[PDB]
Symmetry: D2
Subunit: 386 residues, 4 copies
């Protein structure tokens, strides 16, 4: 069972299943993958659609004639299979010109170029019907201190995004932006390192309602952070416009393991949160089938992403629906957490003797939280041992 | 040389040099330090002021009698020595009643007590002249996934902070709140884990202008983040209300080494940023003299904090004054970073062929950023090897 | 179901379920637990035996008499319950006298004292039947560079262990030592930080055959290391004399979560390894029920330790016994890995054209490893989604 | 000033300054560098010699003739400049054939091919005068648990290294191997992740005396460890056959910053140890000038490696020669650390009352270690203050 279907809204980037397997210490182990192939092979697995960077669909340096040809092939493949394109993004990290950044490159010409390159693909995104546009500034950062004044770099970043919002507004476009944070790699330190930082930045943009976050499992885990907590904060602020699902095993280089791999329990809690919140965005995977795999392994790995999600979905549902679990929830006063602290006004609080003078701290401290029993119920469910 | 004076505005929390040496695997190695002894000794080292947790000054459960008697001896030492109290904070983490949190404890009765305990210290802070009130939610968090629903926790956290802001207002108090982020410890994962999460949170509060952040070197470093970068984003938004300086040697338990120890270069870039930005806040130290040290070792450590800051301040300044460094900065285009990307507007950028069609990417890609020579000049300055 | 029994050989440290919950930020949340009470409670859960630090059974400083009165109760509870004492260890980290270390303390008198203390609990260890004596150098280390010359510290450390081995040999004792590695905490950096340094260190002791390692899941993970891999190297060397099972959520302070919690998959591969290797050592738990828990939570947490190990044992055995998995294993060539590289020798290899000249590198490079399908089968087994 | 000279014995890998700037998310930003140019440029900067991967000097695919040619050119550049080649290593990680490992690849054919490739370069090494042969199993490891049975891997690894040892011995060659540890990258987990693991492995090899370790700064720091401490154990065991100097800014992907960068103070303690231990090995640099740098940045970065080492060398020497520091050392009892714990022997220790019953443990605990004053004097020297 656990067979995924387009109704599950699973999506993959063409750069994922399309990863040739090139790493810092080794060359490609797989041949390039024709976007049409990736479209057809994914639809067959039950995927809902695909996402792409501009350079994944249209080769860099392509002519206006060649560009039109590449999109036609991709279009015909999307129409025949019924696959959609919910999200689009720009590649502002691969080319040598972006070695010092894109929107925050010290050189002004590079920055202007970055914007124009992004704008052209935003138009293409709209045509393909993409409603979300991700921006991952992997080259926005530094390796040394004096090399980048962060404040000036942030001003440039705000200016870049404001211009981007102004553009979609003047064109009457129906597309929002999703900023994807990353603590490091490819840069020593990357600006807007976590979901928290991206969220904060968005608040100082001219039109904030147009920007959200595109958190990625591996990225936040590269800072040893709790992913579902991060995501919880993004939902709390209504800023979760898109998400990247994968696996990461600890603080180290981005491994982009298939969703489910890496921190299993963190993947379980994530699914729990997304389902319980009713999040409606596509479940997009940004992973890289290990370079040890051949083309058949790539498809196995991609199928694994969706499978693990559905498995966790089921287990998380059973956990929350379990009468004994719900009972354990009340025992850990999770219900009181959802109750306002002082809906009786600040004045009533200051006069409430039960809130200070008559509060029996010792009695309160002696009461166990009962989290461990609760957690083992979650473990039994995850492992199917109940 | 490098003798500190009140003019430098150095402040130490009473719990720093007052730490008895108790850690997870050992008992105290030093006797409790009398707050009066702390004030006197610090003033002798050149300190400017001291900070405190309500429980650092007044024992828990103490009666109003013993209460006023403690603040009496304190005020008496500050007046005689000339030390001031710039900041005051609450201790909502030691008492077992706060084992599951304070503002976000699942038990409602505990959350209300947390607000009353804080409020009572907010009055003492104002009575003592302190205009900055720090809030470190060390117990706000969880060890397990279902033990806490972050969205719900954040709602209770917003409520608590709103009520606190409402209180200072109704009282016409001239005080501001500074939220102290932290990724983990003592809780498995702490809410508002980094400077960014704290920033994003405040913007969702009822009166944002009343809250800021109090980042600590060790905290951001426990998530392997670039403290200077995060500090810059705080300043960028003008939310750096307070700061805790100390040392950390990588991702591990919070070490609270004296400032300068741990990541030395990061400390250097921090001073560089704070001084070049003209931040007028006091340089507060929140460290812990190793339990291996006796009372004299404590004062030596405290002196080390200030000494290292003054030494770095001198080196950072000479770095920025050196005409050779200035030239190296221009060679790396740090000046263009400050210049607007598109001062003339969106429609101008779109129609600018130099920003796309006729932009020689390869020519711009061949330009070295000259960051390495720039950074080695910084190294020579820090090391006094110019 | 999954009810554990004494046959499973599960053991717990008295300090585990007996932890009062006192972290470096808060006071204890639970009263002290009587050792006798621990044996009885653990016996009912299905535990096989218990372990202890000298200070967990005898008040520090007790005389010949009181010391004896204490061993009588415990032992009386052992015979009555049928619980055993497979291992004992020394507490050379709590008393403020070991703030700079025990065997590697700079003060000679402290080092000598450390040996006498350890040696006296070795006689007790044997008196109680424990044939394994663990050694965890928690205070062996430093926070600063000149505070500890590691070469001298190792000379001292080696002498201590050599003396201990000479002593057990002179007494004709049938006991072995298990050195327990740790990266940091309570010291900034701890000597012999991982399983490898301990194994290497042991090879320079006078009687290497007498010492082994007692790795802990949490400790190794504090260095972002693969615990199952480390155990594999210990097993390969025949040096896995004991083991500490628990959970850890990434690089940070020692959490000591219950076994199964933290990195779930690492836990799984670890049980897979120990079971497939046929390791006959006791499955010992060194964890700490979160301080948020009451006495009921303590037992719930201890129960989870064994439960989780039992579930994983069944899932790992099912995985290995699955015909489809054995198929994927061959497809991935795990069988060839176990085959010798050059059975016929070096000269035959130098003369073998298939090893160089006529070696079709590309054909071999295009060969898929099929690790993903293998790993997803492992994931379905673990989640009971087969 | 701090001008390097061949007398300092500084060496560089050809792949270092020769790094084209390619990373997981970007193309090269610098053209291929002729090995002749590197040698000429380095000799001009004050370098003493260079090291290389077989494939750095002789491109893969080359014939005996082309190979003969490449070597000839290299040799004459070496004779002209006077540069030497102290160490040689094999590239067993770039070609897709090694995606699953070399000596421990699952496929036997790959394993044999790997050894022939190594053996062939070992001969070239002896010809070039290389006395040390480094080995970095960057591909020896895995991303999933069932993909690799570590024990079997270690068996193949032992078998491979024993075969190499049998070859050097039978050939009468004068060369020893140096195993390079690395926690991860490019593999999820790499076998022999640290100095400790590598040292433990060597002891089980047939001819241990022929193998030592080649520890790298970044590598150990990618596991959050203290490199100087690891070096101290390597030197303690007399197994430091080579070393890779560079910088790393915390737990993250391998940065290979120039030596001095990253953890500055750890670099200081590193030089202090190497200098005081009197290690006569060459100070080899394995770094990568940032891709943001052009050809000129490359040389400026490489000169920075030597420069920083010489600066730290001088500061550490001063620190140790400083009478005030020698006093501080005595006060922190570093002298007693070097004194045998029990020279009077075991039995005399057992009968010594002052070592146990008559030991004033309280009086000892209160004796401060005076580590902080000692470290600040170390800080002051490093920073050129005093
Ligand atoms: Co990624
Ligand atoms: Co701290
Ligand atoms: Co532990
Ligand atoms: Co490296
Ligand atoms: Mg992504
Ligand atoms: Mg603080
Ligand atoms: Mg342990
Ligand atoms: Mg290296």
């Amino acid at each position: 069972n656990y067979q995924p279907t387009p109704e599950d809204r699973f999506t993959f980037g063409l750069w994922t299943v399309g990863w040739q397997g090139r790493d810092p210490f080794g060359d490609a182990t797989r041949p390039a993958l024709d976007p049409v192939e990736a479209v057809q092979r994914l639809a067959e697995l039950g995927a809902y659609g695909v996402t792409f960077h501009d350079d994944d669909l249209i080769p860099f340096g392509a002519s206006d004639t060649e560009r039109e040809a590449h999109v036609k092939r991709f279009r015909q493949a999307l129409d025949a299979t019924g696959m959609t394109v919910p999200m689009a993004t720009t590649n502002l990290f691969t080319h040598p010109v972006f070695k010092d950044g894109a929107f925050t490159a010290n050189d002004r010409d590079v920055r202007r170029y970055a914007l124009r390159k992004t704008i052209r693909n935003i138009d293409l995104a709209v045509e393909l019907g993409a409603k979300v546009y991700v921006a991952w500034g992997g080259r926005e950062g530094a390796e040394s201190g004096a090399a980048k004044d962060v404040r000036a770099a942030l001003d440039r970043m705000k200016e870049a995004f404001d211009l981007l919002g102004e553009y979609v507004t003047s064109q009457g476009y129906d597309i929002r932006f999703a900023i994807e944070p990353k603590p490091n790699e490819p840069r020593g330190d990357i600006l807007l390192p976590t979901i928290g930082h991206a969220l904060a930045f968005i608040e100082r943009l001219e039109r904030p309602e147009l920007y959200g976050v595109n958190p990625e499992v591996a990225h936040e885990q590269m800072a040893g952070l709790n992913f579902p907590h991060g995501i919880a904060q993004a939902l709390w602020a209504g800023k979760l416009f898109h998400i990247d699902l994968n696996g990461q095993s600890g603080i180290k280089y981005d491994q982009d393991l298939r969703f489910g791999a890496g921190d299993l329990r963190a993947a379980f809690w994530l699914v729990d949160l997304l389902e319980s919140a009713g999040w409606e965005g596509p479940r997009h995977f940004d992973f890289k089938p290990p370079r040890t795999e051949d083309i058949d392994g790539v498809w196995a790995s991609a199928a694994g992403c969706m499978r693990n999600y559905l498995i966790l979905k089921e287990r998380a549902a059973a956990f929350r629906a379990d009468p004994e679990v719900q009972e354990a929830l009340r025992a850990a006063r999770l219900d009181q957490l959802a109750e306002p602290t002082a809906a009786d006004g600040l004045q009533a609080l200051l006069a409430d003797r039960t809130a200070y003078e008559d509060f029996d701290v010792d009695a309160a401290a002696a009461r166990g939280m009962a989290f461990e029993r609760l957690d083992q119920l979650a473990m039994d469910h995850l492992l199917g041992a109940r």
